[PDB]
Amino acid sequence: CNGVAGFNCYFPLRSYSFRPTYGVGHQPYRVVVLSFELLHAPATVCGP
């Protein structure tokens, strides 16, 4: 594709274009993921 768009040359990005007029199951969701590690270690982080 020599670095130009065309047939079978699609940019692997797509936009969202969020608007307040969409349906309930369409607005973006802010997501976080917390991962722990249950092993034998100095155990730096501990709860209250």
Partner 1 sequence: FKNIDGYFKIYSKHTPIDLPQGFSALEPLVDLPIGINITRFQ
Residues that bind partner 1 (CB under 8 A): 41-42, 44
Q: Which is nearer to partner 1, 8 or 44 (CB)?
A: 44
Shortest distance, CB of residue 42 to partner 1, whole angstroms?
4
Per-residue burial over 13-33, b = 16 or more CB atoms within 10 Å of its CB, e = otherwise: eeeeeeeeeeeeeeeeeeeee
Shortest distance, CB of residue 43 to partner 1, whole angstroms?
8
DSSP code, position 24: G
Shortest distance, CB of residue 11 to partner 1, whole angstroms?
45
The length of the chain is 48
